[PDB]
Amino acid sequence: MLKSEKQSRYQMLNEELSFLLEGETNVLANLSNASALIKSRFPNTVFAGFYLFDGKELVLGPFQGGVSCIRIALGKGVCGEAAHFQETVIVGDVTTYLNYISCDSLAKSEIVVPMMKNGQLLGVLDLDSSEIEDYDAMDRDYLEQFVAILLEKTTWDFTMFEE
Template sequence: MMFNVESYRGTREENYKLVIKQLSALLEGEKNQIANLSNASALLNQFLGRTNWVGFYLMEEGELVLGPFQGLPACVRIPLGKGVCGKAAKQMETVRVEDVHQFPGHIACDAASESEIVVPLIKDGNLLGVLDIDSPEKNRFDELDQEYLEEFTKVLVSYL
């Protein structure tokens, strides 16, 4: 399957459905978690646009630890409940922030980030980690992004 930006010429919904289909094709038959998360972050980074960081934090001994990502170097450890990632992890629900500078306790790993969406990775009721996406634009992520990124993570988790 070809993966290039030119593939995404439909509506936003059609494009999200295509990227989810591409994710399944990338992960099919591969059991290595790091390989799968690496390909998932690269695929999303190529697909989304107007983002400056796409990656994963994984649960390890009660805190989030940096996993595969695309972007500038990032914070390595995030306690549960701290920042956008920690809040999404603790609540086990997606957190979408229009302006990170207005978010109490925001952890600024990249000063260029203006908005953020964090989607928890949940399998069999257990938190595996979070998908974290930052944008240099305020209000970058909307309900449609949230809906399809949650679907993307459900497909991803089924391969982890």
């Protein structure tokens, strides 16, 4: 995908997220549709979704794709690395990468943007592509701005679903 079109796709992506979340704070509906949205803008996406922090590790959250890894310990895997340092992590080639937890998929490249609030790790937004070297700094800046529109629009509260 051309750089100018990637840039454009991301501009409509982040705007649409703002339009979608306008007036909606539910973390469940937001996290869910967010993954649906990303998946609809990037065809190479083989996985788009979240992994939330259960307090001790990362457990699978709303996502788009095939059956995936359930839990992930910090430091381990691309997602584990990201959650640890709390910084985006990109992987050009996943087949020659050393710390990559392969939960199937035809993922050749992957990126993980950490979600943070009040110095606390809420979890991570992760995307896998069917193409090698498919994520760069452009993807990094827009996905972080995405996560930012997400958290800014979402009240991290699961209260309403208990009992």
